[model samples]
Target: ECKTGNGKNYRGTMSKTKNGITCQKWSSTSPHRPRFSPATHPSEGLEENYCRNPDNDPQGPWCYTTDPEKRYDYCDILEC
Candidate 1:
């Protein structure tokens, strides 16, 4: 998760799609671009680690689980 200046936490995940690797917002919506100022459109194959903490952003590792639905996990625990 990356904490913005407003203390809002946001996270994204890499998804393999027909358009190639796309950035998917944790919740809210899919195809959400990097929550950077000016909010640029999600580009293909942006280094998965690029947004992990490009500069002065507060970022951290994310979590996932072995659910059949491929749901995301925030506590790094298996949601299954």
Candidate 2:
């Protein structure tokens, strides 16, 4: 599926970054401690490790990476 505008309303289950890195769960804080969460930002669509535009970034949807060295990265979401 593709996203429109800034992908803020995007609810797709794309959980991988542009470089094929798995996304860290929004509820977890192992590899990275995210500032957004389902409890803190319930409207941000922070579900599992799915990509989301919690900050309304113009770059579209992104997520915390599972890689210890990488904090967060944008997802390769197709634009509609």
Candidate 3:
């Protein structure tokens, strides 16, 4: 799915980073520990490992990656 603006409301399930890294589950803290989670931000759409813009980041929807070397990165979502 695509997004508009900063994608603060995006709920797409694009669970990969721009570099094709698998997204880490928001509820998990193995590779990367995230500040955002469904428990903390219930309305942020932190489902599975889906990309989201809960922080309203100007870069758009992003997620913690499964790659331990990378903390987090934006998804390759198109503008709407």
Candidate 4:
């Protein structure tokens, strides 16, 4: 688990059901606080906040991203 020097990571895709809709980053849709990224990309809002496994992705997990950066990588489960 190596953290990137710059502090940033990319998410591949978290597929639970794969209903043609990938998991969207809950944090991005957070009404509790402001959205720093603003889902600029189409996938940003449609994509989920999954920390790409270092073994799977070269970028590694979101934890690798340092606090100095203006982004977060987190995910959660749904009740349904």
Per-candidate count of clashing residue pairs (backbone under 3 Å): 0, 0, 0, 2
Writing each residue's lDDT as its tens digit, candidate 1 over 1-80 gives 32344222334432332223332342223333234322342432233422222232232322222332433322221112
Tens digits of per-residue lDDT, candidate 2, 11-73, equal 999999988999999999988998989889978879999999999999889999999999999
Q: Assess candidate 4 and give its lDDT.
A: 0.33
Ranking by lDDT: 2, 3, 4, 1
Model 3 residue 12 CA deviation in Å: 1.0
Return the TM-score for candidate 1, rounded to 2 decimals: 0.20
User: What's every prediction's RMSD, in angstroms?
Assistant: 11.2, 0.8, 0.8, 11.5
lDDT per residue as tens, model 3, 25-44? 99998888889998899999
Global CA lDDT computed for model 3: 0.90
Q: List the residue pairs that clash in candidate 3.
A: none
lDDT of each: 0.29, 0.92, 0.90, 0.33
Query: What TM-score, computed on C-alpha atoms, does each candidate reach?
Result: 0.20, 0.95, 0.95, 0.24
Query: What local lDDT score does residue 35 receive in model 3, on the 0 to 100 scale?
Result: 94
Give a tens-digit lDDT track for model 4, residues 14-35.
4331222233343444322323
